[PDB]
User: What shape does this take?
Amino acid sequence: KCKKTTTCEPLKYNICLGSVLPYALTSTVLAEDSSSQDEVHDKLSLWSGLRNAPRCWDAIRPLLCAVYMPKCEGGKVELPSQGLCQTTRVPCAIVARWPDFLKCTTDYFPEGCPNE
Ligand SMILES: [Zn+2]
Ligand SMILES: [Zn+2]
Ligand SMILES: [Zn+2]
Ligand SMILES: [Zn+2]
Ligand SMILES: [Zn+2]
Assistant: This one.
């Protein structure tokens, strides 16, 4: 439930929203609005407008990176965790009120995952 089968490809960039990613491979399969790593990069640029809400921005960065530039290894991608979603909901409550995020749905944000 914590991983999804997919084809891994090398990361286009080793930076996500100002963080250095320690892993080398990714997939776009979790980013339902994106059909390539090129599109992912453009969507993340749009998300960066949220930098003007600094408390929400700090919380949401690892969630956006876990969705848009997730770690892929062995033909599997890791999903963003329920715990990460629930924490992000509070500082980003006012902002955006992505219904899956607001509800922290358990198919998209599974419980009991190693990277929580
Ligand atoms: Zn490219
Ligand atoms: Zn921080
Ligand atoms: Zn949990
Ligand atoms: Zn859903
Ligand atoms: Zn729990």
Q: What stands out?
A: Residues 1-116 form a domain with the Frizzled cysteine-rich domain fold (CATH 1.10.2000.10). The pocket of zinc ion (ligand 4) is lined by residues 100, 105, 107-108 (CB under 6 Å). Residues 54-68 form the longest helix (15 residues).
